[PDB]
Design a protein around this ligand. Structure first.
Ligand SMILES: [Mg+2]
Ligand SMILES: [Mg+2]
Ligand SMILES: [Zn+2]
Lengths: 60, 50, 190, 129, 152
RNA sequence: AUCGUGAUUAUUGGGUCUAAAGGGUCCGUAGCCGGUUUGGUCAGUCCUCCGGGAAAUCUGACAGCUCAACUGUUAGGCUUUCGGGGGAUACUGCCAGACUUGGAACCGGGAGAGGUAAGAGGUACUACAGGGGUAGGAGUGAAAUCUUGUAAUCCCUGUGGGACCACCUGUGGCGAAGGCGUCUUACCAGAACGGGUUCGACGGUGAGGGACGAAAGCUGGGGGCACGAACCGGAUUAGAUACCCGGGUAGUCCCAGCCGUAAACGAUGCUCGCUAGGUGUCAGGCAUGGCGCGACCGUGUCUGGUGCCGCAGGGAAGCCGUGAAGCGA
């Protein structure tokens, strides 16, 4: 095609403790801790963030 | 006299004229489209080769 | 495919070279883990059939066939005998098509090259005289001064014998030439 | 910095013609770019062109039908009247009734033949042949 | 293109996709995101990473797509914006720190040139903003007196 | 003489790697060049109108000088590139926003002989002293000066000294260039890479002007192991004010300033779009196979550098060739 697309993609990560339905960005530049209870969903790697809990489904 | 990859005129020395390798209709090629491998598309049978 | 892909896998036709070019991408379907990139066998048979259709529009005694490699040397001679085409297997004189006072003078109407990179002098001579050429490239070949491309492994003895027999039988059936040669004739002496 | 998109588009068309490529992409599309492409299409020198937006200025997928020889911008865009086209034609163009100069005018952007028919001049935009 | 004072071009752009709509897979609302933006601003977090923390821990794809407003538009709407732009403040802050370092290392001519380049960028930002009325016409960038963190 | 020749002044219409010619690099004002886009104006601009732009000379014809040039009529030219009205809104400049790609700002895991400041360290050298030992050591094409019987050379021990950072080291890296190689630490800066992060054209170039600017040299204070212009001595030679060899001052080093030049070179100013390929390696990111299927290493692929090869293209050629000397701005 001619249009550019976001090769980096979102996720649907599920919290390991509070079961929060939070949303995180895959190429995280920050420690995406859980919004609600106690958890760190993924740590900021220079490339792709290392997710610690379940990914329900990778989104666009 | 008109290439199938560029359409330029075959007035120079070194122009190759040959029938189609699919339908037999005449297809032309120039030195630049043959040195550079320009893809030629047969306008009748739609044959496309590099 | 007119012949099964398992035969091309067994005969070494699908083996190529560890390095490929960008213009050979369209004839490659998948990267193998070894490094040798497998060409499109369906595309190879398509190119073979199209060339045989193009080679069937002319008499075998006007075709020109050239080869350089030893492994491509025997099937080239088999092609020359089975068709009557004037083959140049082995060493090639640079001024055969040109140089009318030279030994080996010829004035063809189509040129066939067994390997375009190795047979560069024949490509330059054909481009100078203006004779369209159906070539036989590999995974590390470029189609400069080439009209038709045959994607087959020219560095395999069995692959060369099989491909030469397929081209010979295809042309001889298309042009209703009596073809009593068999692949063991085109097979290299092992 | 990008500061002449019409000249960039015509230089890309020149490169694509020189290589003999049937198709080529046009870097960021503009309204005057579209007017030049439409007038060139009506001249028959250029085949097809589509504005494919990309969340940006927009680009073109132009199908070059092999009818031109060279085409770049006219810099500076000279003011031209109805009695001032023939000297520019003798300068840029190669022959009488051969190739056209893209002109921008208050009536519209068009080759200088139709501008002389309109009896209205303006600024030279480009030349194609 | 090349950079401002070094000619090393680069293409590490953040590829934002063509999205003319808000998310359809997210239940977040405009009120939620604006409340998050205001609370993070009151914490002391600059607008560059406000959107980053929106997009990372809340997975907000873009504040403009959902709210219809960018971060600074929401800041001006709520009277929660600074009097000076963040880029000019960052350049002036770096220049002040670099001048503080250079007042004890007078041999550090390379960082003197770095200070000169940042001064050129500061004057470029001030010229653009006075062109667009963000800053006063008479307030020139004094590199010794009128350069403090909050200028008044 | 002057015009043309001569594109030998080049806006049209030239060159500037090697022929004269890219500024050492860079920051940057006036100038100049500038993204797509909605809205408004119409100043340059555009079509048109009206006041002008003396005749003369210019062009053509007619008329009349016998042809002719020439005089009159007449249709054009010049006079130009002024003042003022109406129409158009593409174009540019003006007005008010917006838009995300251009540049700007921030975050992430990595890379780097990037910079200053401090310290420690490596080995060799050297100074003196001590122990051993006793006829030469040094150097050369060959010699001699020099040095040694006041015990040198060589060896061992010990204590100080100043310069210098090897192999590692790469057709590696960082830096605006100059340039930067021991290690540790503190301070600072840029980059590329990742980024549904902030900004909204904030950009390029840039005569003047400003800072950086190798080495040599200069000024003042240090230091002086080594090296080493000058200087002296020994040879060489016809001569040797040189190459060689023996000494060795200024200097090289540091601290505080000055000068401001190099074959400061890629003999290629900088920015952008565009244009066949094959081919190392480096940073980052990314797939996968192995890896003590972990810290790590391989192949593929996008981006940015760093080299060689080369089609088309161009050049007078050597050549250049997505890192142009190609094609435009
Ligand atoms: Mg010095
Ligand atoms: Mg230079
Ligand atoms: Zn939780």
């Amino acid at each position: 095609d001619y249009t550019q697309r976001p090769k980096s993609r979102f996720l649907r990560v599920k919290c390991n403790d509070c079961e929060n339905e939070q949303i995180i960005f895959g190429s995280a530049s920050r420690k995406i801790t859980c919004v609600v209870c106690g958890r760190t969903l993924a740590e900021p790697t220079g490339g792709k963030s290392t997710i610690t809990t379940h990914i329900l489904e990778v989104l666009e | 006299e008109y290439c199938t990859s560029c359409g330029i005129r075959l007035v120079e020395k070194g122009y190759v004229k040959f029938p189609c390798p699919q339908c037999g209709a005449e297809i032309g090629r120039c030195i630049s489209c043959r040195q550079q491998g320009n893809v030629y598309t047969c306008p009748k049978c739609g044959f496309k080769a590099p | 495919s007119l012949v099964s892909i398992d035969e091309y896998l067994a005969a070494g036709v699908h083996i190529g070279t560890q390095q490929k070019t960008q213009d050979m991408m369209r004839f490659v379907y998948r990267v193998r883990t070894d490094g040798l990139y497998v060409l499109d066998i369906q595309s190879t048979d398509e190119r073979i059939r199209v060339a045989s259709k193009l080679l069937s529009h002319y008499d075998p005694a006007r075709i020109l066939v050239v080869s350089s490699r030893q492994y491509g040397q025997h099937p080239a001679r088999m092609f020359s005998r089975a068709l009557g085409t004037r083959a140049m297997l082995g060493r090639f004189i640079p001024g055969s098509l040109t140089n009318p006072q030279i030994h080996g003078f010829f004035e063809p109407d189509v040129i066939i090259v067994t390997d375009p990179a190795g047979d560069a002098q024949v490509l330059k001579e054909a481009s100078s005289i203006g004779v369209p050429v159906v070539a036989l490239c590999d995974t590390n070949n470029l189609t400069s001064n080439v009209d038709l491309v045959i994607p087959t492994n020219n560095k395999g003895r069995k692959a060369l014998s099989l491909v030469y027999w397929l081209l010979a039988r295809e042309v001889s059936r298309l042009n209703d030439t009596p073809f009593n040669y068999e692949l063991t004739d085109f097979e290299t002496p092992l | 910095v990008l500061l002449d998109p019409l000249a960039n588009a015509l230089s890309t068309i020149k490169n694509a013609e020189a290589i003999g490529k049937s198709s080529c992409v046009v870097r960021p599309a503009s309204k005057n770019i579209g007017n030049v492409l439409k007038v060139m299409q009506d001249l028959g020198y250029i085949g097809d062109f589509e504005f494919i937006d990309d969340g940006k200025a927009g680009i073109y997928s132009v199908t070059l039908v092999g009818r031109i020889n060279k085409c770049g911008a006219i810099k500076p865009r000279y003011s031209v009247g109805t009695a001032s086209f023939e000297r520019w034609e003798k300068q840029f163009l190669p022959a009488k009734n051969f190739g056209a100069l893209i002109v921008t005018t208050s009536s519209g952007v068009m080759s200088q033949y139709e501008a002389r028919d309109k009896k209205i001049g303006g600024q030279l935009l480009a030349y194609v042949y | 293109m090349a950079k401002m004072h070094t000619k090393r071009k680069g293409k590490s752009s953040s590829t934002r996709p063509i999205r003319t709509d808000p998310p359809e897979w997210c239940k977040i609302g405009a009120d939620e995101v604006t409340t998050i933006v205001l609370d993070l601003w009151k914490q002391g977090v600059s607008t560059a990473e406000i959107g980053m923390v929106l997009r990372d821990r809340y997975g907000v794809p873009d504040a403009k797509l959902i709210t219809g407003k960018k971060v600074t538009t929401i800041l001006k709407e709520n009277n929660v914006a600074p009097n000076i732009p963040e880029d000019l403040t960052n350049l002036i802050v770096k220049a002040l720190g670099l001048r503080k370092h250079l007042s004890v290392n007078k041999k550090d001519v390379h960082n003197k040139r770095s200070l000169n380049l940042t001064e050129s960028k500061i004057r470029r930002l001030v010229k653009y903003y006075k062109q667009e009325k963000v800053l006063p016409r008479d307030w020139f960038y004094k590199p010794e007196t009128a350069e403090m963190m909050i200028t008044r």
